[PDB]
């Protein structure tokens, strides 16, 4: 249970953006996505001990409505040096995996 | 005529190459009055609007803009080169050198195929792409 | 800016295609060499140019140039008025 | 009737016309062709010197 | 899009001046009418940059004249 | 009109229902046996009749 | 009919089949050196099938199921048409890729 | 050999056309009139060695132009690589035909002048010098190899072989 | 060979020469399209008459089309003579010549 | 009977073979094996028909086979032509008359 999934969650929607250029995109994702709608949190998963970008990052959006337009207008949009691929965030943690296992037997 | 836009100096040429971000920039280096350039430019004019979606065509006069002759070896009648996001893309035509075309082809369809293949490869991330035809032989029988 | 500011880089095949890699004295030397080449050429220049001129004249006699053919229609085209000039339809019809 | 579409088979020595006719007229013409040939053969309209014959 | 009408004129006039085999009913010659560049080697930008700076400053000197 | 930009599909990710009719229009099933095969070794039929 | 007919002079239904070539096929195999001698040049023995009696080809199957029906561009159709040439070249590689056949300058595949 | 010699004699005689009316311009008179040249009287063998060295310098100034030093040209104008060449380096080394033609011409000049200096030193007598010169001119095909870069020279090579037979 | 490109450029230049500068910024493309349409009509054997086109420009276009038609016919015949007599050619040339013939 | 036609046939067959080889690789080979062309279609080859004099090298007929004993080597000539298998028109006609009288 990493203590790093408790910064974006304000009942907001997290878009998981994979296929990111490793050399860049430390904050260029935030620079690109700040235009819509306002200041937000956009992190990049850069593994420690190597400083090498693992690829995927996450972006937190206030509304599902703004998220729809953001996805439809940034899916494949040229960011940094690579086009980005957008999907929904999973955050399959314990409090939800227990419920999933409980539902399985039912 | 050559209603295709013309670039008049090296700064204009490099600005043109850097302007596009998601479309292949095709550049024809040569003299507009050379017959080889005449035919090649006719083909480019024919396909320009068809390939407007993902390509932009430009014509460069060797004498007007000679500063690129040494680096790119522009010394044939007409040459065609492709760029994508400031990266000179190479094509494995089978002619021996993959840097340029250096001859005036006459089929707008193969020209469109070449540009489409270059776009596909460059977007995928390659610096060299393989033509869907081998121009080692003229295929005349 | 020359064209290197693009951050580009050229390519070379064959060590035959042009370049290799110009002061007062070099200017004088180049003038000398140009004079030498012109003087050597002067042998048959007059006859060669005369033959070229006569041959092109006869060829044009036998088959004129395109703008020469269209000169008459161009002259008559001169007549038309500016009012008609901007009223020309378009093939869209 | 309708119009027939003509193209040219290219035998480099010479071109050969090829006509494309509307399907219904094709059917009627085929039936008429078969019937006419059968009746003409039955009545011996064509003497033996008209070739090619069905037999050789 | 395609070039404007005046750019078309610019191209056509140059073509006419360069090709007297077709246009220009005076004479003949196909391509005839009637500078330091970078070699692409990284070990030459300093020399090439100075030459452009050296030439332009001479052009500026001509401009002052 | 220009050529469309050659993007691939996002990729039919839902199936059955409409999509089986979408293929039943044009890409329905086939023999899937002895029509797509060449039977290596012998010729069975006559020789040259491609 | 636009297609050129080579048998413009006879009909299979009336005149019958005027020729026969099964003997020619069998003699061709024998002359080429028997099924085993022929198979030597191919890559069959690299497949390691126990015998050549229960085998069968798969015409136009490819890596995409051959995707015979689709709305592909002309270049993509060209690739789909070059696939069979690729299979044929791989099949006959052992006897095409030798120094006797092609002259000099040999180059090792990376790795 | 007789028959082919006669063939080419007849061809020249038949194709002969009268010369054209020049203006009598003299290259070396123009050079002398220039200021970069001066006259002197030298021994022919000395001038031959001079020309051999100058030709070698000229040819060597043409390979190192690209600053691409993987080709070594010896003093007999035998050009070979200094190492194993990557394919890209082979492509760079590729040089036109005219270059090799000039190289082989200078090679022939080197052969002749070397024979003459041999005789002058005393390694050979006059008879052996003459024999060597005749051998050189009859075997320029074997010794130098200009037919690989100009095929019309096979005419010269075969004509020289026929002349050898006749003599 | 490219007599057609040469003639098209010549006619375009001549037409543009006399046209006042205040209208060439717009009408160049339209007149080129008119040239193309006239050529297409000739090839299709249909009447071509634009009611609004001034008669001098119409005369110039007609002369252009006549010259291009003459070149077209002659080159088609010569190429067919080549191909028939026996010469090395390619699929595109053969198909284009078949269309012209 | 036509000598020109035999030469034309072999020239055209060589043209076809060269086309296949050029498709194979841009550089023409030397002594290309004929097994690839003349092997039957169902056996992996092109099943090409021949009307010329093609001599299969004696080397090409060598073939090996391995089993638990070890490796064993074996051998087995010219390609057949079509005309030897086509029947002459004169014989066709005479036999036709004869067979049809018999059938009557």
Curated annotation (Swiss-Prot), chain B:
InterPro entries: Dim1, Thioredoxin-like_sf
Chain positions found as Phosphoserine: 131
GO biological process, one term: RNA splicing, via transesterification reactions
A GO CC term attached to the entry: cytosol
Keyword Nucleus tagged: yes
Modifications after synthesis and translation: The disulfide bond seen in structures determined by X-ray crystallography and NMR is not essential for protein folding and function.
Subunit relationships: Component of the precatalytic spliceosome (spliceosome B complex). Component of the U5 snRNP complex. Component of the U4/U6-U5 tri-snRNP complex. The U4/U6-U5 tri-snRNP complex is a building block of the precatalytic spliceosome (spliceosome B complex). The U4/U6-U5 tri-snRNP complex is composed of the U4, U6 and U5 snRNAs and at least PRPF3, PRPF4, PRPF6, PRPF8, PRPF31, SNRNP200, TXNL4A, SNRNP40, SNRPB, SNRPD1, SNRPD2, SNRPD3, SNRPE, SNRPF, SNRPG, DDX23, CD2BP2, PPIH, SNU13, EFTUD2, SART1 and USP39, plus LSM2, LSM3, LSM4, LSM5, LSM6, LSM7 and LSM8. Directly interacts with CD2BP2.
Protein name: Thioredoxin-like protein 4A
Source species: Homo sapiens (Human)
Curated annotation (Swiss-Prot), chain C:
Disorder this protein is connected to according to its UniProt record: Retinitis pigmentosa 60: A retinal dystrophy belonging to the group of pigmentary retinopathies. Retinitis pigmentosa is characterized by retinal pigment deposits visible on fundus examination and primary loss of rod photoreceptor cells followed by secondary loss of cone photoreceptors. Patients typically have night vision blindness and loss of midperipheral visual field. As their condition progresses, they lose their far peripheral visual field and eventually central vision as well.
Name assigned to this protein: Pre-mRNA-processing factor 6
Localization terms from the record: Nucleus, Nucleoplasm; Nucleus speckle
Tissue specificity note: Widely expressed.
Processing after translation: Phosphorylated by PRP4K during spliceosome assembly.
Reported function: Involved in pre-mRNA splicing as component of the U4/U6-U5 tri-snRNP complex, one of the building blocks of the spliceosome. Enhances dihydrotestosterone-induced transactivation activity of AR, as well as dexamethasone-induced transactivation activity of NR3C1, but does not affect estrogen-induced transactivation.
Record-listed Phosphoserine modification sites: 71
UniProtKB/Swiss-Prot annotation, chain D:
Localization, UniProt: Nucleus; Nucleus speckle
Tissue expression from the record: Widely expressed.
Domain of life from the UniProt record: Eukaryota
Function: Plays a role in pre-mRNA splicing as core component of precatalytic, catalytic and postcatalytic spliceosomal complexes, both of the predominant U2-type spliceosome and the minor U12-type spliceosome. Functions as a scaffold that mediates the ordered assembly of spliceosomal proteins and snRNAs. Required for the assembly of the U4/U6-U5 tri-snRNP complex, a building block of the spliceosome. Functions as a scaffold that positions spliceosomal U2, U5 and U6 snRNAs at splice sites on pre-mRNA substrates, so that splicing can occur. Interacts with both the 5' and the 3' splice site.
Oligomeric and partner information: Part of the U5 snRNP complex. Component of the U4/U6-U5 tri-snRNP complex composed of the U4, U6 and U5 snRNAs and at least PRPF3, PRPF4, PRPF6, PRPF8, PRPF31, SNRNP200, TXNL4A, SNRNP40, DDX23, CD2BP2, PPIH, SNU13, EFTUD2, SART1 and USP39. Component of the U5.U4atac/U6atac snRNP complexes in U12-dependent spliceosomes. Within the minor spliceosome, which acts on U12-type introns, interacts with PPIL2 and RBM48. Core component of U2-type precatalytic, catalytic and postcatalytic spliceosomal complexes. Found in a mRNA splicing-dependent exon junction complex (EJC) with SRRM1.
Segment of the intact protein contained: 891 to 946 of 2335
Swiss-Prot record, chain E:
Sites of the Glycyl lysine isopeptide (Lys-Gly) (interchain with G-Cter in SUMO2) crosslink: 35
Tissue-specificity statement: Ubiquitously expressed.
Biased composition (Polar residues): 45-54
Outcome when changing residue 47 to W: In a colorectal cancer sample; somatic mutation
Domain of life: Eukaryota
Compartment(s) where it occurs, according to its Swiss-Prot or TrEMBL record: Nucleus; Nucleus speckle
Modified residues (Phosphoserine): 44
Residues bearing the modification Phosphotyrosine: 2
Region feature Disordered, mapped onto this chain: 34-54
Quaternary context: Component of the 17S U2 SnRNP complex, a ribonucleoprotein complex that contains small nuclear RNA (snRNA) U2 and a number of specific proteins. Part of the SF3A subcomplex of the 17S U2 SnRNP complex which is composed of three subunits; SF3A3/SAP61, SF3A2/SAP62 and SF3A1/SAP114. SF3A associates with the splicing factor SF3B and a 12S RNA unit to form the mature 17S U2 small nuclear ribonucleoprotein complex (17S U2 snRNP). SF3A1 functions as a scaffold that interacts directly with both SF3A2 and SF3A3. Identified in the spliceosome 'E' complex, a precursor of the spliceosome 'A' complex.
Free-text function comment from the UniProt entry: Component of the 17S U2 SnRNP complex of the spliceosome, a large ribonucleoprotein complex that removes introns from transcribed pre-mRNAs. The 17S U2 SnRNP complex (1) directly participates in early spliceosome assembly and (2) mediates recognition of the intron branch site during pre-mRNA splicing by promoting the selection of the pre-mRNA branch-site adenosine, the nucleophile for the first step of splicing.
Free-text note on domains in this protein's UniProt record: SURP motif 2 mediates direct binding to SF3A3.
Protein name: Splicing factor 3A subunit 1
Organism: Homo sapiens (Human)
Encoding gene (name): SF3A1
Residues included from the entire protein: 455 to 529 of 793
């Amino acid at each position: 249970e990493d203590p790093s999934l408790l910064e974006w969650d304000a009942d907001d929607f997290r878009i998981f953006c994979g296929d990111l250029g490793n050399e860049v995109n430390d904050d260029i994702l935030a620079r690109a996505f700040s235009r819509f709608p306002s200041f937000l949190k956009a992190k990049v998963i850069r593994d420690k001990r190597t400083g090498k970008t693992k690829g995927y990052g996450f972006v937190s959006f206030k509304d599902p409505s703004d998220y729809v337009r953001a996805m439809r207008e940034m899916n494949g949009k040229y960011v940094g040096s690579r086009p980005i691929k957008l999907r929904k965030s999973m955050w399959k943690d314990r409090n939800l995996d227990v419920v999933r296992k409980k539902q399985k037997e039912k | 005529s050559y209603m295709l836009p013309h670039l008049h100096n090296g700064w204009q040429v490099d600005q043109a190459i850097l302007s596009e971000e998601d479309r292949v920039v095709v550049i024809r280096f040569g003299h507009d009055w050379d017959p080889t350039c005449m035919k090649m430019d006719e083909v480019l004019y024919s396909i320009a609007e068809k390939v407007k979606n993902f390509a932009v065509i430009y014509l460069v006069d060797i004498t007007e803009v000679p500063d690129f002759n040494k680096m790119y070896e522009l010394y044939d009648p007409c040459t065609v080169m492709f760029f994508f996001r400031n990266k000179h893309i190479m094509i494995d035509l089978g002619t021996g050198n993959n840097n340029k075309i250096n001859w005036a082809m006459e089929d707008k369809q193969e020209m469109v195929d070449i540009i489409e293949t270059v776009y596909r490869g460059a977007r995928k991330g390659r610096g060299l792409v393989v033509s869907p035809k081998d121009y080692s032989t003229k295929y005349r029988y | 800016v020359p064209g290197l500011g693009r951050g580009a880089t050229g390519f070379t095949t064959r060590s035959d295609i042009g370049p290799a890699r110009y002061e007062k004295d070099d200017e004088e030397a180049d003038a000398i060499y140009a004079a030498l080449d012109k003087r050597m050429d002067e042998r048959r220049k007059e006859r060669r140019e005369q033959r070229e001129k006569e041959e092109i004249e006869k060829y044009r006699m036998e088959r004129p140039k395109i703008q020469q053919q269209f000169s008459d229609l161009k002259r008559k085209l001169a007549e038309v008025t500016e009012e008609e000039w901007l009223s020309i339809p378009e093939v869209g019809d | 009737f309708k119009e027939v579409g003509i193209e040219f088979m290219d035998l480099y020595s010479h071109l050969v016309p090829v006509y494309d006719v509307e399907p219904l007229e094709k059917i009627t013409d085929a039936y008429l062709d078969q019937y006419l040939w059968y009746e003409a053969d039955k009545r011996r309209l064509f003497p033996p010197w008209i070739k090619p014959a069905d037999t050789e | 899009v395609y070039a404007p009408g005046l750019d078309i004129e610019s191209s056509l006039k140059q073509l006419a001046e360069r090709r007297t085999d077709i246009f220009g009913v005076e004479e003949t010659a196909i391509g005839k009418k009637i500078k330091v560049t970078w070699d692409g080697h990284s070990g030459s930008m300093a020399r090439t940059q100075q030459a452009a700076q050296a030439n332009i400053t001479l052009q500026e000197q001509i401009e002052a004249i | 009109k220009p050529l469309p930009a050659p993007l691939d599909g996002q990729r039919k990710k839902r199936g059955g229902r409409r999509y089986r009719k979408m293929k039943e229009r044009l890409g329905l099933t086939e023999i899937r046996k002895q029509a797509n095969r060449m039977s290596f070794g012998e010729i069975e039929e006559d020789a040259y009749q491609e | 009919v636009l297609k050129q007919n080579p048998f413009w002079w006879t009909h299979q239904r009336h005149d019958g089949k005027l020729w026969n070539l099964n003997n020619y096929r069998t003699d061709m195999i024998q002359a080429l050196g028997g099924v085993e001698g022929i198979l030597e040049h191919t890559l069959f023995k690299g497949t390691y099938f126990p015998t050549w009696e229960g085998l069968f080809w798969e015409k136009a199957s490819g890596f995409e199921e051959s995707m015979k029906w689709k709305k592909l561009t002309n270049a993509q159709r060209s690739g789909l048409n070059q696939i069979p040439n690729r299979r044929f070249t791989l099949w006959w590689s052992p006897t095409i890729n030798r120094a006797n056949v092609y002259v000099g300058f040999q180059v090792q595949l990376d790795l | 050999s007789y028959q082919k010699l006669l063939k080419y004699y007849v061809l020249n005689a038949l194709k002969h056309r009268p010369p054209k009316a020049q203006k009598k311009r003299y290259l070396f008179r123009s050079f002398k009139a220039t200021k970069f040249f001066q006259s002197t009287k030298l021994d022919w063998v000395e001038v031959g060695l001079q020309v051999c060295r100058q030709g070698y310098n000229m040819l060597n100034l043409l390979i190192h132009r690209k600053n691409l030093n993987y080709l070594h040209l010896d003093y007999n104008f035998n050009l070979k690589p200094v190492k194993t060449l990557t394919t890209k380096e082979r492509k760079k080394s590729r040089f036109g035909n005219a270059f090799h033609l000039c190289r082989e011409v200078l090679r022939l000049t080197k052969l002749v002048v070397d024979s003459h200096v041999q005789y002058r030193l005393g390694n050979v007598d006059a008879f052996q010098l003459a024999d060597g010169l005749q051998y050189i001119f009859a075997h320029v095909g074997q010794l130098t190899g200009m037919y690989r870069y100009k095929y019309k020279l096979m005419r010269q090579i075969r004509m020289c072989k026929d002349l050898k037979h006749l003599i | 060979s490219h007599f057609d490109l040469e003639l098209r450029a010549a006619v375009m230049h001549d037409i543009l020469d006399m046209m006042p500068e205040g209208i060439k910024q717009n009408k160049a493309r339209t007149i080129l399209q008119h040239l193309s349409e006239a050529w297409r009509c000739w090839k299709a054997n249909i009447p071509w008459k634009v009611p609004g086109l001034p008669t001098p420009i119409e005369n110039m276009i007609l002369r252009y089309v006549k010259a291009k038609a003459d070149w077209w016919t002659n080159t088609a015949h010569y190429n067919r003579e080549r191909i028939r007599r026996g010469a090395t050619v390619d699929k595109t040339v053969c198909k284009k010549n078949l269309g012209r013939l | 009977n036509t000598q020109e036609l035999l030469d034309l046939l072999v020239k055209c067959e060589n043209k076809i073979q060269t086309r296949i080889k050029i498709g194979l690789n841009s550089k023409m080979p030397s002594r290309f094996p004929p097994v690839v062309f003349y092997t039957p279609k169902e056996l992996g080859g092109l099943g090409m028909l021949s009307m010329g004099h093609v001599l299969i090298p004696q080397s090409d007929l060598r073939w090996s086979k391995q089993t638990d004993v070890g490796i064993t080597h074996f051998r087995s000539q010219l390609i057949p032509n079509l005309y030897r298998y086509i029947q002459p028109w004169e014989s066709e006609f005479i036999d036709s008359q004869r067979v049809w009288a018999e059938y009557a």
